[PDB]
Amino acid sequence: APGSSRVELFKRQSSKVPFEKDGKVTERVVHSFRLPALVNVDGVMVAIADARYETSFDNSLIDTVAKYSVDDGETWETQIAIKNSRASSVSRVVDPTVIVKGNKLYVLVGSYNSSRSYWTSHGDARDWDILLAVGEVTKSTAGGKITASIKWGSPVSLKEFFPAEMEGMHTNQFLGGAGVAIVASNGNLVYPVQVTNKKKQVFSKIFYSEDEGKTWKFGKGRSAFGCSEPVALEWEGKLIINTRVDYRRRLVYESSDMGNTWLEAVGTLSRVWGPSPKSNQPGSQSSFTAVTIEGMRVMLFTHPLNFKGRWLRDRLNLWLTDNQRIYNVGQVSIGDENSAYSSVLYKDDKLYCLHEINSNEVYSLVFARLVGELRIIKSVLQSWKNWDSHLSSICTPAGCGPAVTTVGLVGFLSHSATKTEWEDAYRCVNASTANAERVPNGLKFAGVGGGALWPVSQQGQNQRYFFANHAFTLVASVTIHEVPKGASPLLGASLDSSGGKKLLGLSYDKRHQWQPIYGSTPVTPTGSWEMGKRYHVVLTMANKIGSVYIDGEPLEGSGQTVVPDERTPDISHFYVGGYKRSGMPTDSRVTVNNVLLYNRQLNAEEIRTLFLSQDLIGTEAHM
């Protein structure tokens, strides 16, 4: 990450805090700092975390610490924001979850007195309470300098707002999701929380306040069981709740009603991020925020790749998305260091990250200036803005006809390419190629093993195109140069590595007929094609039903079921211009230009517009 730098701000076994017991205060060295939350309150940076005094073990002596800085993190003041009960050597306030409103810091923590086991193992609520503290931030210009101060009020218990029963079950305990929460546009304070029932199941809900934290309510809905440490943001009027699932892919939900109803975001972010290369290890806390960079509203997300496994969680990664495309900014941590939990802040056009580093179960929080990362972010964002503008600005055949649609446009293969890759104009996911000749706005393919492969499940740990299993539209322009000896592939979605089992696709045969493929259904050839003519192809799949269009018209027999019901598809890849498989005997001799991938089924007018503007959309001349 060139240009980037960091310091060990909360330094393990070294940094001191003001430890208060029985009216006496003493500067005390801390063993480990975990659970970072980094915010901006009216120009003052505030960093909140767990201060684990004697060991990094979860069930041990822990206070909530705060450092604050009025100089962008070059110098800091240190406090204890919330102290534990002092009842035993293992008394602790935990998973501090932060909201900023005006000059106030609202901090929600669980509080435990003497238990030696993790909260989810508790058969009862006897050792638990749920507390809220408010910190008031004031600034002074006396002396020609800026001096900040933070007055932490005494914590108040919110237990009276926790109902004994919820949609059937009996409740046990609840905690904030850790890190940073939000104020909704309507002004509500909004905490995504993790909750236990008497069966020891864990699940996530929305815990919110309409009156500045005086009283709290729960939404009636919930995630599925197994979803912990939830993190939420507001996007286009809805909450987006991104959850941790140990040993499984992360689940993402949307709610428009403060959590009364939760819908899995299968068409965008759900099931995209895996907790380890094989997605069979513990998950992690994540930073997940909505911000505006160069006038464009976007989302930033962090999660470790966990190549090592168990809870080591090396290789902290940062991600950028506009709820359509998803781009890997890259690794924030350094080398193979262990680096699990994190908080990303964007303030006055500069990007910072406070994150953990773990050596032998001893934890520091480093404070990094993400210079290189914001540079890459701005570049990608300008490319998204560039191509969206390019498409939207085309005067379509008609005056001008309807604008080409960029709503839900995720990927686009056009003029840019290299020897073995067809480049995504949106810079997220490229297609691998074989036997391909570059031509204007695309590629010409020839011979056994020829074609392009656009990976879906082959993406591996992080699957940006998971939405296609639920709905998509794939568009391309195709020209056939030679009559084939049998049926040959042009374009499709493959359910296995070879392209043998297809979800939806289009082939062409020796009798000059098209062969559209609907799932495992028997194939009936139809229509007619000529060598050399450029054809417009559109494949749509939504609500388990697949359609194929040529030149803006449905192939006779389109609209057939392509997936057995309740059974969800796992697409391997999209194939284009061949199978790109030497094992597959076919020889597709064809030119493909301008491949577009959308995360929804386009309507009739959108399809017709794409058909009518085929020769206008290439990237060749605006480069």
How is 177-225 classified by DSSP, letter by letter? -SEE-EE-TTS-EEEEEEEEETT--EEEEEEEESSTTSS-EE-S----T
Domain boundary among 369, 384, 411: 369
Answer for the pair 208, 189: CB distance below 8 angstroms, yes or no. yes
H or E element that contains 250: none
* Number of neighbouring beta carbons within 10 Å of residue 385: 13
The C-alpha atoms of residue 68 and residue 72 are separated, in whole angstroms, by 9
Contacts of residue 597, Cβ cutoff 8 Å, sequence gap at least 6: 409, 410, 411, 412, 454, 465, 468, 472, 473, 474, 475, 574
Burial 36-49 (b: 16+ CB within 10 A, else e): bbbbebeebbbbbb
H or E element that contains 402: none
Three-state SS at 421: strand
Dihedral, CA of residue 3, residue 376, residue 242 and residue 407, to nearest 10: 170
In the chain, the amino acid numbered 67 is K
Dihedral, CA of residue 439, residue 443, residue 446 and residue 450, to nearest 10: 160
Whether residue 284 is found in the same domain as residue 329: yes
The C-alpha atoms of residue 235 and residue 78 are separated, in whole angstroms, by 34
The C-alpha atoms of residue 145 and residue 165 are separated, in whole angstroms, by 53
Domain boundary among 326, 354, 369: 369
Instruction: Name which of 279, 347, 254, 404 is nearest 38 in CA terms.
Output: 347
Whether residue 485 is found in the same domain as residue 614: yes
The C-alpha atoms of residue 139 and residue 71 are separated, in whole angstroms, by 13
Q: Both tokens of residue 205? A: 């809900």
Contacts of residue 23, Cβ cutoff 8 Å, sequence gap at least 6: none
Token match 């406070």: residue?
354
Q: Both tokens of residue 574? A: 């999209």
Three-state SS at 591: strand
Domain boundary among 369, 385, 404: 369
**Strand ranges, E, within 215-260:** 217-218, 228-235, 238-244, 252-255
Number of domains in the chain: 2
What resolution in angstrom units was achieved for this structure? 2.0
**What single-letter DSSP state applies at residue 378?**
H
Q: Both tokens of residue 251? A: 């689940």
- Residue 106's Cβ-side half-sphere holds a number of Cα atoms within 13 Å equal to 21
Instruction: Name which of 352, 336, 333 is nearest 344 in CA terms.
Output: 352
Instruction: Name which of 467, 493, 178 is nearest 323 in CA terms.
Output: 467
Whether residue 550 is found in the same domain as residue 512: yes
* Number of neighbouring beta carbons within 10 Å of residue 154: 9
Residue 74 phi, psi dihedral angles, 5° rounding? -80, -35
- Strands 421-424 and 179-180, bridge-based pairing: unpaired
The C-alpha atoms of residue 224 and residue 204 are separated, in whole angstroms, by 8
Q: Both tokens of residue 147? A: 């001096």
Whether residue 323 is found in the same domain as residue 398: no
* CATH number of the domain residue 618 falls in: 2.60.120.200
Instruction: Name which of 203, 202, 178, 181 is nearest 191 in CA terms.
Output: 181
Whether residue 414 is found in the same domain as residue 524: yes
Q: Quick one: how far is CA 366 from the chain centroid? A: 23
DSSP result, 8-66:
EEE-TTT-EEEEEETTEEEEEE-SEEEEEEEEEETTEEEEEEEEESS-S-SSS-EEEEE
Three-state SS at 342: strand
Backbone Cα Rg of the chain: 27
Whether residue 345 is found in the same domain as residue 385: no
Q: Quick one: how far is CA 527 from the chain centroid? A: 42
The C-alpha atoms of residue 6 and residue 608 are separated, in whole angstroms, by 53
Answer for the pair 243, 236: CB distance below 8 angstroms, yes or no. no
Contacts of residue 58, Cβ cutoff 8 Å, sequence gap at least 6: 94, 118
The C-alpha atoms of residue 195 and residue 228 are separated, in whole angstroms, by 8
Give the N- to C-terminal CA distance of the chain in Å, as an integer.
27
* CATH number of the domain residue 300 falls in: 2.120.10.10
Instruction: Name which of 96, 71, 100 is nearest 81 in CA terms.
Output: 96
Whether residue 457 is found in the same domain as residue 328: no
The C-alpha atoms of residue 228 and residue 110 are separated, in whole angstroms, by 15
Helices (runs of H) and strands (runs of E) counted in the chain: 2, 46
Answer for the pair 352, 584: CB distance below 8 angstroms, yes or no. no
Token match 């322009």: residue?
477
Residue 209 gets the label, from left (phi > 0), alpha (psi -120 to 50) or beta, of: beta
**Strand ranges, E, within 236-341:** 238-244, 252-255, 263-264, 288-293, 296-304, 316-321, 326-331
Whether residue 296 is found in the same domain as residue 401: no
* Number of neighbouring beta carbons within 10 Å of residue 280: 12
Q: Which range of residues forms the domain containing residue 353?
A: 1-369
The C-alpha atoms of residue 200 and residue 194 are separated, in whole angstroms, by 12
The C-alpha atoms of residue 445 and residue 179 are separated, in whole angstroms, by 50
In the chain, the amino acid numbered 512 is H
Sheet with 288-293, edge to edge strand ranges = 288-293, 296-304, 316-321, 326-331
Q: Both tokens of residue 586? A: 């076919």
Whether residue 333 is found in the same domain as residue 379: no
Beta bridge partners, 517, equal: 505
Q: Both tokens of residue 285? A: 């806390």
Whether residue 596 is found in the same domain as residue 615: yes
The C-alpha atoms of residue 439 and residue 622 are separated, in whole angstroms, by 16
The C-alpha atoms of residue 542 and residue 473 are separated, in whole angstroms, by 9
- Strands 156-157 and 128-140, bridge-based pairing: antiparallel
Q: What is the largest CA-CA distance in the chain?
A: 93
- Strands 431-434 and 451-455, bridge-based pairing: antiparallel
Answer for the pair 525, 513: CB distance below 8 angstroms, yes or no. yes
Q: Both tokens of residue 69? A: 């800085």
- Strands 92-101 and 179-180, bridge-based pairing: parallel
- Strands 560-561 and 545-550, bridge-based pairing: antiparallel
Contacts of residue 209, Cβ cutoff 8 Å, sequence gap at least 6: 188, 189, 190, 215, 216, 217
**What single-letter DSSP state applies at residue 468?**
G
* Number of neighbouring beta carbons within 10 Å of residue 72: 13
Whether residue 419 is found in the same domain as residue 451: yes
Token match 């933070």: residue?
150
Answer for the pair 556, 527: CB distance below 8 angstroms, yes or no. yes
In the chain, the amino acid numbered 123 is G
The C-alpha atoms of residue 315 and residue 338 are separated, in whole angstroms, by 7
Q: Quick one: how far is CA 362 from the chain centroid? A: 29
Whether residue 352 is found in the same domain as residue 427: no
Task: Tell me the CA distances in angstroms from 415 to 225, 382, 395, 426, one per residue in order.
Answer: 46, 18, 20, 13
